[PDB]
A paper describes a structure:
In this system, thousands of copies of transmembrane (TM) chemoreceptors, the histidine autokinase CheA and adaptor protein CheW, form highly ordered structures known as chemosensory arrays, which cooperatively integrate the sensory inputs of multiple receptors to regulate the autophosphorylation activity of CheA. Core signaling units (CSU) of the chemosensory array contain six receptor dimers, organized as two trimers of dimers (TODs), a single CheA dimer and two CheW adaptor proteins. MCP molecules contain a periplasmic ligand-binding domain (LBD), TM four-helix bundle, and cytoplasmic kinase control domain. CheA functions as a homodimer in the CSU; each protomer comprises five domains (P1–P5) joined by flexible linkers.
In this study, we present the structure of the complete CSU from phage φX174 E protein lysed Escherichia coli cells, determined using cryo-electron tomography and sub-tomogram averaging to 12-Å resolution. The map of the full CSU, determined at an overall resolution of 12 Å, clearly resolves six full-length chemoreceptor dimers (red), a central CheA dimer containing distinct regions for P3–P5 (blue), four CheW monomers (orange and yellow), and the lipid bilayer headgroups (gray). In the periplasmic-focused map, the ellipsoidal shape of the individual LBDs became prominent and clearly indicated the orientation of each LBD, a feature not discernible in previous studies. Using AlphaFold2, we further predict the atomic structures of the CSU’s constituent proteins as well as key protein-protein interfaces, enabling the assembly an all-atom CSU model, which we conformationally refine using our cryo-electron tomography map. The constituent models were assembled via rigid docking using the predicted interfaces and our cryoET map to produce a preliminary model of the CSU, which was subsequently refined using molecular dynamics flexible fitting (MDFF). The resulting trajectory identified interactions between two co-planar clusters of charged residues on the Tsr LBDs, involving K99, E102, and K103 on helix 2 (cluster 1) as well as E124, K126, R127, and D130 on helix 3 (cluster 2). Rather, these interactions appear to form a pseudo-lattice by which the Tsr LBDs roughly maintain their relative orientations and inter-domain distances. The P5 regulatory domains are rotated slightly compared to the orientation required to form interface I with CheW. Intriguingly, the P1 domains were observed to form a dimer wedged between the two P4 domains where the aforementioned excess density in our cryoET map is localized. The P1 domains themselves are predicted to interact in an anti-parallel fashion mediated by P1 helices A and B, such that the substrate histidines face away from the P4 catalytic site and toward the P1/P1′ interface. The interaction between P1 and P4 is primarily mediated by a string of oppositely charged residues residing on helix D and the C-terminus of helix A in P1 and the α3 helix in P4.
Numbering used by the authors:
A (entry chain A), D (entry chain B): 257 to 647
B (entry chain E), F (entry chain F): 15 to 157
C (entry chain D), E (entry chain C): 1 to 131
Write the structure that this text describes.
């Protein structure tokens, strides 16, 4: 014996209806948490505290509804070994794909889209990530190669890594091919930083799209397919050791924590994942800067101040930064200040696409309604990271 | 029967739109300015938990004399792809234009273009300018 | 790594239940006074699938009970045994017991030995008297 | 070829967890929805509007989770031919089973407890009900029987009937057996009413239950399982005609529809299914009664007037019916009035069992809580039905 | 009398997705350098159900394609057939063809005749080398 | 071994109960009386979506003199299978009685039965009565 239970067949079409019903449920339920905030915690203390119970139940129910559509990842791990055992023989190699963490699960809709992304990585590890058997013996390694395919949960995200044992991706080929395209690169970058260069459009592990690495599939296409699914991608390569390629796939794509700020009768929102801390500006720290902007000394670093009122042309706002407040941000191994007028706190609301009734600008990522019924605009952090350089 | 349209006033001139595209009518309400947008767009206002942008047709036509009063009215629409409202100084009167009353647009220069105009509504001594609010709000400029 | 052995057990218990349900409906449309050749093959190939997993995971109670039915249906479709209302009633009485014995494995219990020793004789004796 | 789909294995435990999450959600929004109505509409202006959209979507997702958990009734009807076509040939009879409404569905948990009850009814029809072919032709009845197992939906319930054209349930045999055990009977009861008296302890279609029927299950045990599920049972049979047994099954047992009645400060609730009409009787429809009581004339019929303040001993209540309000109730076929002070309206409150911290008291069945916070006692209509009989 | 048989066709396609998947899992973990008789039994269970299961719903193309492969699995688990890196790869490649033939029925179409005539000659060719 | 208890006053005497059985102390407010119930029970008070019945100890114990001043406090208990509260004239002190301070109580209680007393708490010129609240709220009247 081991474990007993029961199960029944559930039509996939009916599962899609659950996501549609529970999806709008959280939206309609979110409105209850907006107007209820106007009530005071003294008199209406039980109501406010009870309102949060209805919200957390909807969130927990939404995450549970998605689990009904998930399936064991062991079924997905049955396509990569067949390709390795089949492709290794054609290329003339002996590789063994090891499977780690089989209890992991993934949404069925994502499984149908996670094959080609991951499949493109397995072909790269065997095309150049692992050298011939004769070369492995010279470097003290075993003749038979090895390939790891781990997959475990990390809170509200699904982490999947693909690590190998060979030398990994080439180093001089990436820098040599990156310099020709005009990308800011150099030899001082470490193996981890050099791995973040293949994400450019039309840039794969080789000089051109090789047939061995999938037909019409490259690293540039793998990234675009992950962004549509609300996921991310990271690489931790190392010359001589191997090449680890991590991918993230959040469970739910609706609620997003963020700091609510106000800029002269204009309540904005800033993602919390990028917010680091804040402080009171000082005249001794503010200095000029190209493009009319300014800088702020933050512990041996003059972060660029991205005045939110000049970019959007907000009238009546405190032009002097000394009277306002600055919120530090971070994204992509580099920081960048952001000048605001006032702050509020951590508010968890549902996102909305402004293109449904108008359009989206580079300075906006998603809309949402506040507690007082007013509409808010979530400021994209990916833009601020580059706007400071353009200005 | 003839085609029905909703007529409204905008200071001196008068325009009209299809009644089927109109959802409801309600007084002016507070809006929220959008970051970097034209001047003829006031903002967005909440309505049953839906973001309904508010556009001022009087400012869109680029008029010389512009006025503002507390009796402003906003006509809510329901297009086939979006739900954007329109601001009007005051509704006029619902009519049922026939095939003979709906004349083509003028040949000289006007406020909008030929594609953004359905025709001209004749009603006695009151010439109405039919505006195709559908494709107007869903044009390339608004996307 | 690989999936736990419980998945293979629960899967067979669920799949087998679906086969017994669909297979049982075949006798409904199949009138006892006019058995269609195409319908007899559907019942044979249906119970045959249950014999595979029943004999692989160690379900002797279900494998033996299913193996006997596979022999009766085999001799009835290729032209080696007659079919009448009396034999059709035995299949219905047999499939019902197979469902009870299958539920025993779901709850991790030994099927009723009295029902097994009683249904096996009805299937084996029929293979000799009908001839 | 209309359209196809697929399905994935889902554990029953995971589906059952959804009912618990959505269960508290439906119960949470119900309590919060009542508070928004009692409070002023200013702060709850848009909250009440969003509650309407959520009140419907909350049930849509609930019914969707249940529908996915149900199974077609054909799976349950596929087991009856095994007992009909087989037992008919063994005993020497001809019975043809007919299935009506196969598209109907039913909860899996309900299928694991309604097969044997229904299986016992079919077994009795093939022994005591339906006779031999010769006896049927003698009385002009067709030789071949006709057992029909109907089934269909009913809003928030499921109806299942077992119609039969057998010899029919005897009337004189039930009255003699019911009166012996001490059951109130009379000749005024029609053939359809006497059929509902076969639920006595240890009794079924025939007096010999344990001797004939192998399994120790009868009408007394069948009704017991129905009470645990929250359903009902009805029988409409007659001698020399046929037999029909209806069985209902609920879907959600967490909300009870009932009007909130007030009786001097204290507030109570009355079920809505039992309330027939209500008015303000005057001096032109009030007569005395033996024992210091009164009766209400409703279209000639003088119904008994039961004072609600006497049962609970409420001080300062409207003892006179001309000042208060009288509502006509019903429980078990017979109608009876009830005196109260002032009404409120129809409100869907959440049932709250009082046995969790004490025990049931006479005159009360359950309780709940209003928007403010006070506890509302749900009066039991079954108890009041027995008070008028003693008067 | 009986529900529409079209609902069961989609059920078999769902089971095949698990059987075909599980069939490959055992073929992958089964190293050709040191086979295991215990793993060969699970491989036969997946192919045995599809063979008897496919034919139950009238699927003739998928039945013949699975019968030829099942005959090789039966002789392998019983120690009557040799296995190497080349033979194991053929079973994995066969699972890919069986998946294409399954997709044909999922779309209410018949598999390609060219693909069927190729996989059959591949399985029959190995039978001559083993025997 | 030593055990802590919660002391409380009820008239001209002071009783005690195990601290482990107590859940939390709250303020005394109006309750919803339930007819056809014992006299020593006032009503019920919802707490966290659970009906918590309230009991008045000042009326029980064969005591006529009862008060409802501002010092009246209600104590919420938690007997696992039951969560019934109790009202007291006012929480007094808290004592960490040991094996030497907890003396066996007489067989004949002062105002309870012969099995509703755990012991007697000693404290100089203050003799506390350790009432067995576990069995007190499970007698024939509470079921």
């Amino acid at each position: 014996r081991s474990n007993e239970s029961t199960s029944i067949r559930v039509a996939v079409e009916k599962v899609d209806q659950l996501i549609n019903l529970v999806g709008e449920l959280v939206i309609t339920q979110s409105m209850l948490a907006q107007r209820s905030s106007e009530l005071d915690p003294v008199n209406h203390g039980d109501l406010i505290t009870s309102m949060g119970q209805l919200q957390r139940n909807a969130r927990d129910l939404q995450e549970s509804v998605m689990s009904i559509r998930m399936m064991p990842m062991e079924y997905v791990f049955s396509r990569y070994p067949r390709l390795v055992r089949d492709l290794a023989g054609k290329l003339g190699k002996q590789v063994e794909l090891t499977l780690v963490g089989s209890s992991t699960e993934l949404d069925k809709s994502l499984i149908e889209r996670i094959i080609d992304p991951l499949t493109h990585l397995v072909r790269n590890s065997l095309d150049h990530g692992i050298e011939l058997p004769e070369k492995r013996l010279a470097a003290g390694k075993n003749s038979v190669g090895n390939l790891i395919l781990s997959a475990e949960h990390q809170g509200g995200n699904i982490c999947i890594e693909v690590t190998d044992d060979g030398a990994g991706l080439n180093r001089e080929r990436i820098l040599a091919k990156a310099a020709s395209q005009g990308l800011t690169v150099s030899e001082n970058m470490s193996d981890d930083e050099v791995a973040m260069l293949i994400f450019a459009p039309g840039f794969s592990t080789a000089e051109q799209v090789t047939d061995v690495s999938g037909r019409g599939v490259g690293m540039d296409v793998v990234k675009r397919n992950i962004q549509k699914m609300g996921g991310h991608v990271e690489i931790q390569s190392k010359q001589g050791t191997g090449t680890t390629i991590r991918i993230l796939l959040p469970l739910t794509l609706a609620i997003l924590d963020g700091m609510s700020v106000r800029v002269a009768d204009e309540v904005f929102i800033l993602p919390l994942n990028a917010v680091m801390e804040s402080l009171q500006p000082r005249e001794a720290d503010l200095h000029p800067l190209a493009g009319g902007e300014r800088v702020l000394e933050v512990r041996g670093e003059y972060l660029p101040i991205v005045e939110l009122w000049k970019v959007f042309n907000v009238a009546g706002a405190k032009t002097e930064a000394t009277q306002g407040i600055v919120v530090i941000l971070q994204s992509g191994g580099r920081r960048y200040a952001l000048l605001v007028d006032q702050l509020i706190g951590q508010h968890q609301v549902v996102v909305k696409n402004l293109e449904s009734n108008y359009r989206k600008v580079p300075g906006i990522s998603a809309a949402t309604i506040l507690g007082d019924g007013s509409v808010a605009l979530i400021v994209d952090v990916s833009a601020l990271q580059a706007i400071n350089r353009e200005q | 029967s003839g085609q029905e349209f909703l007529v409204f006033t905008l200071g001196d001139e008068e325009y009209g739109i299809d009644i089927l595209k109109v959802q409801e009518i309600r007084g002016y309400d507070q809006v929220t300015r959008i970051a970097n947008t034209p001047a003829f767009i006031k903002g967005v206002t909440n309505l049953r938990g839906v973001i309904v942008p508010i556009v001022d047709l009087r400012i869109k036509f680029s008029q010389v004399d512009v006025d503002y009063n507390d009796n402003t009215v906003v006509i809510v629409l329901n297009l086939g792809q979006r739900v954007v409202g329109i601001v009007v100084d005051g509704v006029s009167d619902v009519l049922s234009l026939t095939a003979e009353q709906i004349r083509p647009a003028p040949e000289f220069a006007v406020t909008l273009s030929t594609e953004y105009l359905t025709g001209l509504g004749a009603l006695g001594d009151r010439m109405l300018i039919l505006v195709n609010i559908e494709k107007l709000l869903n044009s390339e400029e608004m996307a | 790594m690989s999936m736990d052995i419980s998945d293979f057990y629960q899967t067979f218990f669920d799949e087998a239940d679906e086969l017994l349900a669909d297979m049982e409906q075949h006798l409904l449309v199949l009138q006892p006074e006019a058995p269609d050749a195409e319908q007899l093959n559907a019942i044979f190939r249906a119970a045959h699938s249950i014999k595979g997993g029943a004999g692989t995971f160690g379900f002797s109670v279900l494998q033996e009970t299913t193996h006997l039915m596979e022999n009766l249906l085999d001799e009835a479709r290729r032209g080696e045994m007659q079919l009448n209302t009396d034999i059709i009633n035995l299949f219905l009485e047999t499939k019902d017991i197979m469902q009870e014995q299958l539920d025993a494995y779901k709850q991790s219990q030994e099927p009723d030995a009295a029902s097994f020793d009683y249904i096996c004789q009805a299937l084996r004796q029929l293979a000799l008297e009908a001839k």
